[PDB]
Amino acid sequence: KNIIIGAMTALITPFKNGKVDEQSYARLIKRQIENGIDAVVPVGTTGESATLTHEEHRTCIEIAVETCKGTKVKVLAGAGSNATHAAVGLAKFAKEHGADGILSVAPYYNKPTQQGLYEHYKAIAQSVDIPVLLYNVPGRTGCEISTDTIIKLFRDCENIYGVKEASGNIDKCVDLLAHEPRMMLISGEDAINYPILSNGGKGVISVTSNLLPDMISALTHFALDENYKEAKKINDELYNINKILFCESNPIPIKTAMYLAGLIESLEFRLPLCSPSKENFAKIEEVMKKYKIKGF
């Protein structure tokens, strides 16, 4: 199976006067490339996929593909949808426009059954020939891809090579890798990056890496080399920022942090997402002071 693993960043999408700041987007991706990141994920949840138009979503995939040409950094395009026909269309766009693979979140709101999730992902995987990473985040979608469904899709669909778990369930991550040790388990939960890697996970899709890509990259590569003392040390040091980046709904804190670090021009969201509270703004600012934030 072809895989995309290592340290990866769920890219934020900067806005300027209600439109996608495309130069800031490319500049942010190049900052990720230059700090050891192995792959970037345009237009995930952290990239506000819900409020981008289908055309802006496509533009951001293209910018990511264009920016990473001539580097070893891969593009794992955000292509999830709660409608299978739309998810197939995004997957086909990502394939035809040079993405190295796709991340495909479990359908949200409409709560498909396990059989529906299987058929949903089978239709996506059969539509392209690039690697497909499942994405389970039940707190966001209202549905869970069971371990059995993940393993079945991995074994039945040639290009489905793993899952990005954001479920706070280390038991499930043992379950997954004990029964199917060839799949690529990816951490979608920064605070527990090291435990997931230490059990045989092969990478991270990180929110914190937007702010501290060098630290998340070092953590992941230490862990992949079984240097668990150095990987755990970074994971422990990052715990405070990893948690405060979810004091409000992601990506509200991370965009606040990027703005406070001067890495983005304006602190702009698209409704229903909004600027954080004044208290949380100050709490994000205070935790940042304990970390060294790389510039451009």
Place this chain on the structure above:
Amino acid sequence: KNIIIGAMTALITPFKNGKVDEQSYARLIKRQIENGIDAVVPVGTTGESATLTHEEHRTCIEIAVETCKGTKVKVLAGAGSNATHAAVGLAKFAKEHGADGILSVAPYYNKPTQQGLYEHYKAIAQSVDIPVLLYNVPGRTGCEISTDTIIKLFRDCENIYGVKEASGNIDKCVDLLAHEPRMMLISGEDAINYPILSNGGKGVISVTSNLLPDMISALTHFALDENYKEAKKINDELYNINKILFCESNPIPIKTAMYLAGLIESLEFRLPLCSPSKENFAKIEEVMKKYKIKGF
């Protein structure tokens, strides 16, 4: 405040080949009208809003308005979105195409803060002059509209007049009507229709009414006329079918029941939704036998 209350049906959307069966759709609405229903809700969750195109969503609103003209039946159009710009667009379409009001679900997946929900709904309410009913279903959206936010929106916006609660939280329904008794609390949870009505709720937006509109209508009208004895009696009798209609994710069981009753031609969903499992198919069929289903 202008309000839309009473017994309301979250209409299923029948498919025929790969498209919406528009004549069956109109036929189902006239069956609802004939069975005492006060309003119909096109393209809600039960109507598979996630997998309809924006054009199909708009078409189903038009058919509902067309069909309910000259009857007392109102159209509370499903107009929710997890992107505020899209929810404003659906709200404005519903106003300009003759809907009596809109149902607007809390944003799903991107999980806005309470402040974001306020601004999301304030932007929608200010975009039209027809009643707006909030819709809280955290099991599916991943977020909750708090009691404080619902009451604030009710008091701050002229056309926001209440909430359809599908949260299994009768405590919250006491909280809502004790602090703001002027709002229209609507049950979005069939099994507990009567308890919500008996506490001062003023209507239901029902899934079971798709199959048994006469029973849900009588239940609501018994309760609003303070005949609690008969309202509870129908609620108790409907419990078995109310529960089996969610043995799998709505609207998979209700569409199965409508197909088994001969009310729709094919048992068709749009992926990721799928026909139910086989023993669940038999359980829906067995519970249906204890109820008298009205034909056309």
